[PDB]
A paper describes a structure:
Orange Carotenoid protein (OCP) is the only known photoreceptor which uses carotenoid for its activation. It is found exclusively in cyanobacteria, where it functions to control light-harvesting of the photosynthetic machinery. In the active state, following OCPR (red state) binding to the cyanobacterial light-harvesting antenna, the keto-carotenoid dissipates excess absorbed light energy through non-photochemical quenching (NPQ), a vital process for cyanobacterial survival in turbulent waters.
In contrast to a previous crystallographic investigation of OCP photoactivation, we observe that the absorbance spectra of OCPO in solution and in crystals are nearly identical, thereby providing evidence for the same electronic structure of the carotenoid in both crystals and solution. The data furthermore supports identification of glycerol, acetate, the Cl− ion and 401 water molecules in the crystal structure. The location of Cl− in this study was confirmed by long-wavelength X-ray crystallography. Cl− is resolved in the CTD, where it coordinates four water molecules through ion–dipole interactions at distances of 3.0–3.2 Å (HOH16, HOH23, and HOH46) and 4.0 Å (HOH41). The closest CAN carbon is C12, located at 4.1 Å distance from the Cl− ion in the CTD. Three amino acids (L248, T275, and P276) are within 4 Å distance from Cl−. Tyrosine Y44 and tryptophan W110 are located in closest proximity (4Å) to the C6’-C7’ = C8’-C9’ moiety in the hydrophobic pocket which also contains the β2-ring of the carotenoid. Together with W41, residues Y44 and W110 interact with the carotenoid β2-ring through π-π stacking.
Residue numbers in the entry: 4 to 315
């Protein structure tokens, strides 16, 4: 089953401090949630610059941003608290319809406006609650790759989803990289063509080729999230959330599994277009391939430390 395949390579130590820290953050008072992330954002910006949101994304968030910018200060603060509290409001429903990148670009803009004083800032001299100060301390002790994953997950969690098949807004799909200019990965130990083609197609934004590597019932499990099952949902996820990554796999190991299956573990690094080469996340991929080589299951794990990379 997909759910049992979740257990392959049980030695892999994932960075479960990330969902732990998100769960602590999610307990906090909404104003402290907003202050804490402001605090973390300012500090992090001393050494790491976030890439600008794409034009399409900004256009899609523009109405909502304008609405907030038109509010009085107290209402601005209430609107941001509504998003953090996951209140059911029109703003919260609009926000929930957005892909992660659009939500991130919305908050990018608000951060700039708060820095400039045009959107109500965190109150001057604000002191975090006892629980919130310790949450921030944990965040600031993590590796940058973990730090940025905590911030993304806090952003994505905000807002209010009412319904099963509500509208989904995402950025337009980029055209795949021309075949001529495509790079090929090299992985120590691993010549498996399905793994190599996985990595190379994702790096080229070639989602239609990538999806064809999977079994019809196959699943992909992103870090700290449940498996996404079947070709339509996995392709959806590629198109909405997996554009412009850079996968830098380094080494792997290849083992038999029950029934002519093969299990392969690869470790390496990943860069998100929000940070480019300044943040390299430590990642493992865990593949379960059927006898024909298609992908029945792949898990992508954020690793606890670089000491989890194979043969560090
Ligand atoms: C919120 C907020 C603010 C602002 C906050 C702001 C502006 C925060 C901005 C935060 C940003 C821009 C975070 C970006 C994170 C991106 C990550 C972790 C991507 C990981 C990708 C991975 C691992 C993908 C890997 C993958 C591989 C390898 C596969 O093989 C398959 C695909 C898959 C995707 C799984 C303010 C500052 C205004 C204060 C108030 C406040 O609350
Ligand atoms: Cl990303």
């Amino acid at each position: 089953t997909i759910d049992s395949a979740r257990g392959i390579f049980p030695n892999t130590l994932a960075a479960d401090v990330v969902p732990a820290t998100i769960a602590r953050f999610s307990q906090l008072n909404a104003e402290d949630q907003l202050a804490l992330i402001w605090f973390a954002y300012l500090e992090m910006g001393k050494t790491l610059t976030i890439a600008a949101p794409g034009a399409a994304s900004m256009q899609l968030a523009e109405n909502a941003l304008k609405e907030i910018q038109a509010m009085g200060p107290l209402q601005q603060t209430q609107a941001m608290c509504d998003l953090a509290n996951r209140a059911d409001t029109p703003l919260c429903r609009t926000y929930a319809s957005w892909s992660p990148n659009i939500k991130l670009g919305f908050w990018y803009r608000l951060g700039e406006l708060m820095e400039q004083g045009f959107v109500a800032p965190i109150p001057a001299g604000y002191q975090l609650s006892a629980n919130a100060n310790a949450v921030l301390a944990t965040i600031q002790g993590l590796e940058s790759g973990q730090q940025i994953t905590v911030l993304r997950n806090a952003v994505v969690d905000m807002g209010f989803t009412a319904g099963k098949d509500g509208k989904r807004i995402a950025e337009p799909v980029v055209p795949p990289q021309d075949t001529a200019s495509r790079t090929k990965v090299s992985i120590e130990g691993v010549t498996n063509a399905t793994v190599l083609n996985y990595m190379d197609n994702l790096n080229a934004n070639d989602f239609d080729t990538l999806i064809e590597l999977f079994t019809s019932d196959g699943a992909l499990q992103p870090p700290f999230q449940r498996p996404i099952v079947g070709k339509e949902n996995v392709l959806r996820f590629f198109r909405e959330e997996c554009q412009n990554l850079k996968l830098i796999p380094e080494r792997g190991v290849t083992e038999p599994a029950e029934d002519g299956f093969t299990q392969i573990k690869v470790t390496g690094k990943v860069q998100t277009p929000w940070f480019g080469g300044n943040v390299g996340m430590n990642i493992a991929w865990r593949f379960l391939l059927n006898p024909e080589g298609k992908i029945f299951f792949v898990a992508i794990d954020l690793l606890a430390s670089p000491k989890e990379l194979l043969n560090f």
